[PDB]
Amino acid sequence: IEKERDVILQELQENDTSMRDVVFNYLHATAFQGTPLAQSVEGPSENVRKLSRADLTEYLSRHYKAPRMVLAAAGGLEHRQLLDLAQKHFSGLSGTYDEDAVPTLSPCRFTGSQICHREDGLPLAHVAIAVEGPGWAHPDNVALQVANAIIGHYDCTYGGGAHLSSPLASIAATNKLCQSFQTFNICYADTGLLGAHFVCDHMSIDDMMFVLQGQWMRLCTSATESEVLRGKNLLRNALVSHLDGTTPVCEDIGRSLLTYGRRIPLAEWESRIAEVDARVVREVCSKYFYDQCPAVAGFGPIEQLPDYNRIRSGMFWLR
């Protein structure tokens, strides 16, 4: 307990350099203020120093209960083989608990805010903007994964350059507005984050947040079936390609049984994809992008970063 205490304090010093992880941790701090979700997985260095064996036995004796847990597998085995071992071993778990031992999760308060950690010494500028998400089980998650996929993602190593389809990626490779960006949709129990991450030189931020927000508002107002169809075909391949190997499959089993309660087969995902068209995307993005109060984060020479009222000003059009 005391050895790993020293190790984890050494890890935080390393994660102080992983600028990417910092931003999301700053991001959740601001979107989800005053709630647990603002916390990090690792927590502050103080609690790492001020911890006890007793604190853990409390944590383990409380949360690790069979009903909240899942065993799952994949590969060259059989279901029936798994049961004979579960009863052999996992029959001994505490399948019960006191009248109010297991907590429940209430919704968490999203809020619109900004955090701007200025550090000019560092050569590049990580940025992350997002909004409130639906949650896991909400069905419009499907449509959004398309919408992000229309925007796609980019690094300076992709050889397509200007000829890419995502007009954001096309512009970025042309004018060298950035080195990298992407599109994420983190899904929590009844909410989530939806937005994007990007890296760029300190003299190039204002150009990105003017094109990025343009594409969002472009979709909220007018998107074509061709590019939606382009996005759909990406979402198909990602699910298929993500499910290649016994490891990511049983991941998909495990969390889906915790998030959704069941697993969804790719046939049903495709069925949900099939109900998408341009009309769906315009509406859903208009619910969750158009004229909302986002969360913003910055780390590095973010001097050029538009102030939140300009960010918020660009979350709508006069059209």
């Binding site: 158009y290 004229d291 709508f316 059009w317 006069l318 059209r319």
Partner: protein, 58 residues
């Protein structure tokens, strides 16, 4: 929900719809304000204006 939220969902969301409210508001505002304003002025200056006495000289 409240009225303010209903107003936003229908009117202040689309900037096209938004603007038409403002013109529509101006018309009924232009009418309502002028009537109310004149009534106060006349009520203060009752019996001093031309029309208040004009009836005597027709």
């Amino acid at each position: 929900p409240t009225l303010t939220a209903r107003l936003y969902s229908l009117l202040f969301r689309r900037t096209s719809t938004f603007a038409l409210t403002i013109v529509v508001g101006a018309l009924f505002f232009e009418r309502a304000f002028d009537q109310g304003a004149d009534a106060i002025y006349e009520h203060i200056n009752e019996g001093k204006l031309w029309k208040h006495i004009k009836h005597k000289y027709e």
